[PDB]
Amino acid sequence: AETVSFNFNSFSEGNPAINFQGDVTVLSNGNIQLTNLNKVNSVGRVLYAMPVRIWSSATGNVASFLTSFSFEMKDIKDYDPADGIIFFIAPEDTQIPAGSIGGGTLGVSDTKGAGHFVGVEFDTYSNSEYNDPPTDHVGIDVNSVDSVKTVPWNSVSGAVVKVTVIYDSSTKTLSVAVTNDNGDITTIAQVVDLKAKLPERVKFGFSASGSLGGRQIHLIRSWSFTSTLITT
Amino acid sequence: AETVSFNFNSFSEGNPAINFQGDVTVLSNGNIQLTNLNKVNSVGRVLYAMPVRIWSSATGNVASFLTSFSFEMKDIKDYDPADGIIFFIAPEDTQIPAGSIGGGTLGVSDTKGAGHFVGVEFDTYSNSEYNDPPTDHVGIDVNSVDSVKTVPWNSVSGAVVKVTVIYDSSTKTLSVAVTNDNGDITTIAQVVDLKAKLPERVKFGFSASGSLGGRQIHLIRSWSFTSTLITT
Amino acid sequence: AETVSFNFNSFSEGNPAINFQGDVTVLSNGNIQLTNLNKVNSVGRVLYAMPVRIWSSATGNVASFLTSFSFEMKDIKDYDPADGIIFFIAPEDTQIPAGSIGGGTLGVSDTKGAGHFVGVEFDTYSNSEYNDPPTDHVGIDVNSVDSVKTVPWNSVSGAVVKVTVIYDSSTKTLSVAVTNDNGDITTIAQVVDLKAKLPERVKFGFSASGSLGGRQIHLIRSWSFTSTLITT
Amino acid sequence: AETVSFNFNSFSEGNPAINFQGDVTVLSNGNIQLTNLNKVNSVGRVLYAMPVRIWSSATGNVASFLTSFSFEMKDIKDYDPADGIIFFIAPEDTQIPAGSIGGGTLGVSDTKGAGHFVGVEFDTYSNSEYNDPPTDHVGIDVNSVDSVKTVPWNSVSGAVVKVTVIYDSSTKTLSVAVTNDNGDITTIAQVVDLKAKLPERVKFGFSASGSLGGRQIHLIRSWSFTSTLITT
Ligand SMILES: CO[C@H]1O[C@H](Cn2cc(CSC[C@H]3O[C@@H](S[C@@H]4O[C@H](CO)[C@H](O)[C@H](O)[C@H]4O)[C@H](O)[C@@H](O)[C@@H]3O)nn2)[C@@H](O)[C@H](O)[C@H]1O
Ligand SMILES: CO[C@H]1O[C@H](Cn2cc(CSC[C@H]3O[C@@H](S[C@@H]4O[C@H](CO)[C@H](O)[C@H](O)[C@H]4O)[C@H](O)[C@@H](O)[C@@H]3O)nn2)[C@@H](O)[C@H](O)[C@H]1O
Ligand SMILES: CO[C@H]1O[C@H](Cn2cc(CSC[C@H]3O[C@@H](S[C@@H]4O[C@H](CO)[C@H](O)[C@H](O)[C@H]4O)[C@H](O)[C@@H](O)[C@@H]3O)nn2)[C@@H](O)[C@H](O)[C@H]1O
Ligand SMILES: CO[C@H]1O[C@H](Cn2cc(CSC[C@H]3O[C@@H](S[C@@H]4O[C@H](CO)[C@H](O)[C@H](O)[C@H]4O)[C@H](O)[C@@H](O)[C@@H]3O)nn2)[C@@H](O)[C@H](O)[C@H]1O
Numbered sequence: 014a015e016t017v018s019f020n021f022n023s024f025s026e027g028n029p030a031i032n033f034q035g036d037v038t039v040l041s042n043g044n045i046q047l048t049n050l051n052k053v054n055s056v057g058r059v060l061y062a063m064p065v066r067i068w069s070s071a072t073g074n075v076a077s078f079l080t081s082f083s084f085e086m087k088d089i090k091d092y093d094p095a096d097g098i099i100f101f102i103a104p105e106d107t108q109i110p111a112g113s114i115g116g117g118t119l120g121v122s123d124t125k126g127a128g129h130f131v132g133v134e135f136d137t138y139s140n141s142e143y144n145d146p147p148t149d150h151v152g153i154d155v156n157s158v159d160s161v162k163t164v165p166w167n168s169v170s171g172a173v174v175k176v177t178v179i180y181d182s183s184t185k186t187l188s189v190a191v192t193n194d195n196g197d198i199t200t201i202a203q204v205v206d207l208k209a210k211l212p213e214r215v216k217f218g219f220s221a222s223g224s225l226g227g228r229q230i231h232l233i234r235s236w237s238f239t240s241t242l243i244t245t
Numbered sequence: 246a247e248t249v250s251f252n253f254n255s256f257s258e259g260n261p262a263i264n265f266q267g268d269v270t271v272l273s274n275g276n277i278q279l280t281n282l283n284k285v286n287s288v289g290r291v292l293y294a295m296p297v298r299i300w301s302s303a304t305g306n307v308a309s310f311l312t313s314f315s316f317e318m319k320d321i322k323d324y325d326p327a328d329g330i331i332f333f334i335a336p337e338d339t340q341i342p343a344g345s346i347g348g349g350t351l352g353v354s355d356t357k358g359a360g361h362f363v364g365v366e367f368d369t370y371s372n373s374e375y376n377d378p379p380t381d382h383v384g385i386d387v388n389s390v391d392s393v394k395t396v397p398w399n400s401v402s403g404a405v406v407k408v409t410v411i412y413d414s415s416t417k418t419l420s421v422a423v424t425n426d427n428g429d430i431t432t433i434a435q436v437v438d439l440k441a442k443l444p445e446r447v448k449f450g451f452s453a454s455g456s457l458g459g460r461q462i463h464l465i466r467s468w469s470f471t472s473t474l475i476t477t
Numbered sequence: 478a479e480t481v482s483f484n485f486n487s488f489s490e491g492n493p494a495i496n497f498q499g500d501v502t503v504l505s506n507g508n509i510q511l512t513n514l515n516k517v518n519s520v521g522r523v524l525y526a527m528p529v530r531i532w533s534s535a536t537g538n539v540a541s542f543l544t545s546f547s548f549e550m551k552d553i554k555d556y557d558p559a560d561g562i563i564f565f566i567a568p569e570d571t572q573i574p575a576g577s578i579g580g581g582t583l584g585v586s587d588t589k590g591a592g593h594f595v596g597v598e599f600d601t602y603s604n605s606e607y608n609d610p611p612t613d614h615v616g617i618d619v620n621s622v623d624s625v626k627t628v629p630w631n632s633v634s635g636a637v638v639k640v641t642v643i644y645d646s647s648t649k650t651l652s653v654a655v656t657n658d659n660g661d662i663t664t665i666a667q668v669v670d671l672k673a674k675l676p677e678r679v680k681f682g683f684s685a686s687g688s689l690g691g692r693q694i695h696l697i698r699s700w701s702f703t704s705t706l707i708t709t
Numbered sequence: 710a711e712t713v714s715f716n717f718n719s720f721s722e723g724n725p726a727i728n729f730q731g732d733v734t735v736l737s738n739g740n741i742q743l744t745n746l747n748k749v750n751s752v753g754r755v756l757y758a759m760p761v762r763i764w765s766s767a768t769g770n771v772a773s774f775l776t777s778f779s780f781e782m783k784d785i786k787d788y789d790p791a792d793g794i795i796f797f798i799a800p801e802d803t804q805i806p807a808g809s810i811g812g813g814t815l816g817v818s819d820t821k822g823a824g825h826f827v828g829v830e831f832d833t834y835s836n837s838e839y840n841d842p843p844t845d846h847v848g849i850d851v852n853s854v855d856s857v858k859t860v861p862w863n864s865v866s867g868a869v870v871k872v873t874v875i876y877d878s879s880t881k882t883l884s885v886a887v888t889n890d891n892g893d894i895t896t897i898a899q900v901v902d903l904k905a906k907l908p909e910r911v912k913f914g915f916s917a918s919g920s921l922g923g924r925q926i927h928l929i930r931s932w933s934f935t936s937t938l939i940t941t
């Protein structure tokens with residue numbers, strides 16, 4: 014079997030293992046800050062630099078994966094706390110969309126909300142243009158920020174949030190468990206055919222964005238991942 | 246919302262949070278040993294002592310849960326390494342079945358392989374009488390040790406195994422990710438309607454068994470659990 | 478180490494984590510109302526259902542704990558605002574004393590004011606029979622509603638009160654900080670040997686009572702608790 | 710009564726309510742980082758800018774207080790994670806000791822470990838010169854980093870730690886409860902006569918230090934405080 018495994022307890026600027034895109038910076042404490050608090054339509058993304066083979070064209074086999082990460086969103090004075098973080102999967106050549114308006118696009122889609130990715134968004138602003146539910150939510154996205162499915166959630170300013178994701182290749186199920194500060198868990202699951210929506214090799218990572226009036230601290234604190242593709 | 250949250254980094258006798266059933270002992274290192282290596286058809290089970298309200302007849306709501314545990318199975322001289330461990334959910338009055346033959350029943354079912362439980366088994370012996378697959382396997386069990394679904398797996402003697410389980414109440418999906426010693430991940434997922442198969446109040450735990458010729462060390466090393474029920 | 482931890486942001490009927498005793502009800506907003514406003518000598522108590530092992534006869538070790546809760550007392554028309562709330566610790570078999578007169582006994586003691594418990598009372602009626610100070614007071618109680626120590630306090634009708642309690646096992650100190658509506662803090666601390674006054678296994682909870690002419694709303698709004706016992 | 714009350718969910722270097730001393734910086738995420746990771750014998754301290762009157766030469770009365778704060782210590786590559794954080798109380802003219810060697814002094818004492826302060830240290834290095842216990846520990850310090858009392862503790866890299874402190878003026882007891890990431894609680898309490906050891910007006914704050922080979926990330930995430938002095 015073919016296994017990709019890594020663990021980040023902290024992150025650093027001089028690390029070739031991470032691709033830094035756009036407005037992302039690494040703080041002295043080791044956290045990744047995705048957006049620039051002084052920039053209009055700020056977009057920042059991080060990707061695990063090695064492409065991951067999620068399916069084989071030879072066997073037709075699809076990989077399963079288990080991933081865990083921790084993040085924090087914090088309100089800043091005079092700005093609407095927006096727009097949120099998306100944990101995404103995309104083709105290995107993925108870049109911030111050209112002329113990205115940030116905001117509701119979460120740095121992965123065009124103005125109409127379309128792109129080439131599969132993601133788990135932690136959405137803190139209701140964009141009517143992307144049919145967002147009225148409150149903070151966790152969504153499962155397939156090539157669109159107009160989520161296939163959402164669950165109500167609450168983004169607590171300055172709270173450390175823990176996420177666990179399981180992709181089961183046999184049932185094609187993407188399952189997410191989110192652990193809040195008040196200790197409650199929020200879950201969301203959706204059948205997503207990764208072999209049909211994404212290429213053989215993909216990159217995994219995080220994206221966040223803001224607009225002129227919508228900005229907040231988006232921090233990635235830790236990330237562990239394991240994928241296993243059966244090679245028989 | 247109604248949340249049950251606990252964490253065991255180790256265990257101890259006299260801890261009122263744990264119900265000990267049958268042949269279970271607590272080792273000096275804090276590990277729970279489920280079976281007695283000198284007993285024929287040994288059965289040992291541990292349960293979280295407090296009943297958990299997994300669903301409500303008033304709202305129709307079903308809880309979601311995130312749980313993680315680590316276990317170890319070790320071969321002993323002469324005996325066939327058997328029979329395995331099951332992480333199970335059952336009515337709050339659950340007891341080892343009367344006249345239990347241990348073995349392939351994994352301490353949760355009768356001789357015909359039937360019982361009242363939902364479980365995730367880590368099965369190390371192929372029982373043709375319960376239509377077991379030919380190799381070691383992880384199974385999803387619904388009132389029977391004749392699994393609704395299995396996945397090939399490999400039980401490595403003396404290896405510490407990590408498990409993560411997500412139950413998403415909205416899709417009724419039970420998703421399991423198993424992390425082996427060699428670094429590979431094994432997953433299995435099944436739609437299981439807990440509200441249809443179990444009562445409102447349940448107990449969560451682990452069970453293991455052996456026969457005359459089939460015996461091995463079955464150890465529970467750690468257990469964390471969070472369940473949330475929407476109260477509306 | 479052996480740790481018991483929980484956090485209630487709200488409450489619900491049928492939650493098996495909570496034992497309801499006497500006249501307790503759960504309001505639609507999630508608050509617990511301890512007494513029945515239409516009953517003479519009303520007594521209501523809530524207990525965390527799982528026993529907590531506060532000390533071990535084998536090691537001689539005593540647990541430390543940290544707990545925080547919020548409550549509200551509100552006057553009702555015609556009745557004298559009485560009698561108050563007690564946060565208490567008692568043997569795991571604890572029940573409302575048989576033939577309880579409610580009132581100044583706070584639902585934990587007999588008519589002479591004696592019982593088997595350790596508590597922190599938020600007393601709103603001066604019972605000369607229990608040597609109560611002349612004004613509202615916070616008291617530390619050891620097997621009696623005739624407090625070992627009190628501090629003057631003021632119970633404001635309809636005000637949300639926040640309490641924090643620390644028990645340090647090494648010094649045997651029970652420390653209490655009460656945050657009033659006007660922003661001031663009230664503290665009270667007393668050396669209490671829990672190992673000498675209580676059994677190994679105990680229950681934690683809240684009790685409130687009233688009399689014929691002494692009735693008020695007694696509400697428990699939230700409760701978080703963590704205890705840790707050092708094990709062999 | 711005289712009450713001082715404040716709450717910090719985030720900190721800014723610009724704000725006048727806080728005094729910055731030495732190598733302290735404010736990160737864009739709002740956290741205070743006490744030491745400079747690239748400096749030998751780095752010392753950084755923070756203080757609530759307004760002096761708080763803890764006792765009165767007119768009445769003899771001593772204030773009680775309740776304070777809560779959260780911190781994080783994180784390991785850095787190639788350096789020994791040292792030396793720790795101290796929550797301290799000192800005269801209003803307090804400054805980093807002249808020619809401070811950082812290290813085991815925690816930025817509050819001279820080379821011999823003496824100074825003018827009362828503190829709660831979260832010590833991560835064993836300095837035999839200050840009679841430190843062999844493991845990580847929480848200590849209560851009175852004019853010395855040779856603690857009046859310590860309790861074994863464990864500093865987990867990248868873990869958010871919650872602390873609650875109660876000072877009860879009547880018993881002169883300083884009680885501390887520390888909530889770890891593994892869920893366990895650590896407590897320590899000591900009788901400290903603040904009137905005898907400190908002036909009437911004092912400053913409250915945090916200090917951290919490192920040395921040549923001993924460095925780590927020291928972060929203050931939040932801080933709440935309330936003190937009440939009886940003026941009758
Ligand atoms: C008739 O057709 C023409 O005229 C249209 C008329 N129009 C448009 C408008 C106002 S547009 C809505 C508001 O939106 C925010 S952006 C928003 O901020 C959030 C944080 O609060 C989040 O970050 C979120 O993600 C992000 O999207 C702006 O800043 C603000 O100024 C503006 O009022 N008012 N009139 C125009 O649309 C057409 O193109 C053009 O052809
Ligand atoms: C015609 O009908 C009558 O005769 C039947 C005839 N029978 C039965 C048998 C042999 S039964 C199979 C073997 O099984 C193991 S048990 C096994 O060990 C594993 C570890 O290796 C695992 O732990 C596993 O979980 C556990 O099940 C025994 O120990 C061993 O001795 C035995 O040969 N041989 N003939 C009988 O069935 C009927 O009731 C009766 O009416
Ligand atoms: C000589 O000996 C005999 O005669 C005694 C004579 N007695 C007794 C009395 C009056 S007893 C005091 C008053 O008390 C309240 S109860 C009170 O209400 C509060 C709210 O306002 C709080 O809730 C508080 O906690 C609760 O206690 C009653 O309702 C009220 O009617 C009554 O006047 N008057 N005479 C009797 O004691 C002896 O047993 C008997 O042998
Ligand atoms: C005979 O008398 C003369 O000779 C003495 C002889 N000496 C001294 C020494 C070695 S001194 C001990 C070691 O200490 C660390 S500092 C330490 O780092 C920690 C992180 O790991 C923490 O941060 C902690 O807080 C901090 O204290 C240094 O970096 C390292 O190089 C050094 O070996 N070796 N010989 C000298 O003492 C006298 O003054 C002088 O008169």
Ligand SMILES: [Ca+2]
Binds near residue numbers: 096
């Ligand atoms: Ca949005």
Ligand SMILES: [Ca+2]
Binds near residue numbers: 349368369377
């Ligand atoms: Ca089997």
Ligand SMILES: [Ca+2]
Binds near residue numbers: 560581602603609
């Ligand atoms: Ca009274």
Ligand SMILES: [Ca+2]
Binds near residue numbers: 792834835839
């Ligand atoms: Ca030290």
Ligand SMILES: [Mn+2]
Binds near residue numbers: 145146
């Ligand atoms: Mn959305």
Ligand SMILES: [Mn+2]
Binds near residue numbers: 366368378382384390
């Ligand atoms: Mn099986």
Ligand SMILES: [Mn+2]
Binds near residue numbers: 598600609610616
């Ligand atoms: Mn009283």
Ligand SMILES: [Mn+2]
Binds near residue numbers: 846854
């Ligand atoms: Mn020390």
